[PDB]
Amino acid sequence: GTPEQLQAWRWEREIDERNRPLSDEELDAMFPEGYKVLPPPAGYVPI
Amino acid sequence: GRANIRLPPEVNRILYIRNLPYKITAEEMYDIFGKYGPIRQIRVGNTPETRGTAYVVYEDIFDAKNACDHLSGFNVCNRYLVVLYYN
């Protein structure tokens, strides 16, 4: 009988990438937490 | 060096507003902020500690700064509003 065993390691940070430009989606990431969107009312027809 | 030039880099298209009424609809907000031109996007506080204040986003930085000044000290429903920039 043999007490067969193993070991474990770790890994460093992820490799490089090319994050998107200052698109519309960054506005979501830049707005504070707890602020819901305010879309216009349905059927709104101004002048 | 720190000179003086208009359209400062400390300002963004995102304008923070304080002292907003607790009861208001999108109908009013689009009529108020749309008075100066097109509006990019708006959000409003929904938590007990956020309600009463909001940040508006304009399509340009030019039109944003133009109205930023003219909306300072504006009185609505017998209360004055306050304008600040995104830091």
Side-chain angles (χ1 to χ4, degrees):
Chain A
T2 329
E4 318 303 23
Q5 79 306 136
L6 79 177
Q7 269 297 345
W9 301 109
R10 295 89 178 273
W11 301 114
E12 288 57 52
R13 276 178 155 196
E14 293 155 86
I15 63 175
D16 101 99
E17 49 66 45
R18 312 198 76 74
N19 286 292
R20 279 270 184 184
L22 281 177
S23 295
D24 178 78
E25 294 287 32
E26 286 301 283
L27 195 58
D28 192 284
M30 285 170 60
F31 262 59
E33 189 76 309
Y35 279 80
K36 193 58 153 289
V37 190
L38 187 72
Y44 196 76
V45 178
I47 49 61
Chain B
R2 292 199 79 187
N4 300 113
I5 62 171
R6 77 201 74 200
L7 195 78
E10 78 192 359
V11 182
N12 289 147
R13 307 89 170 272
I14 308 175
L15 304 169
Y16 182 45
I17 318 295
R18 297 169 68 105
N19 205 30
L20 296 171
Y22 291 115
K23 305 97 88 284
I24 189 155
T25 55
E27 306 145 61
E28 297 285 295
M29 296 297 287
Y30 276 100
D31 186 274
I32 296 162
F33 293 81
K35 191 75 69 52
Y36 297 106
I39 318 169
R40 206 302 191 270
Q41 204 167 321
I42 289 170
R43 305 201 176 194
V44 289
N46 263 222
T47 13
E49 198 170 272
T50 56
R51 282 168 52 244
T53 65
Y55 311 77
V56 175
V57 189
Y58 270 100
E59 307 200 323
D60 247 327
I61 185 160
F62 319 130
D63 74 324
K65 260 269 66 184
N66 288 357
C68 186
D69 283 60
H70 289 24
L71 200 61
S72 67
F74 190 57
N75 172 107
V76 285
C77 295
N78 313 116
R79 289 297 192 179
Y80 61 101
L81 299 179
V82 174
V83 186
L84 180 58
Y85 327 115
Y86 182 77
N87 188 38

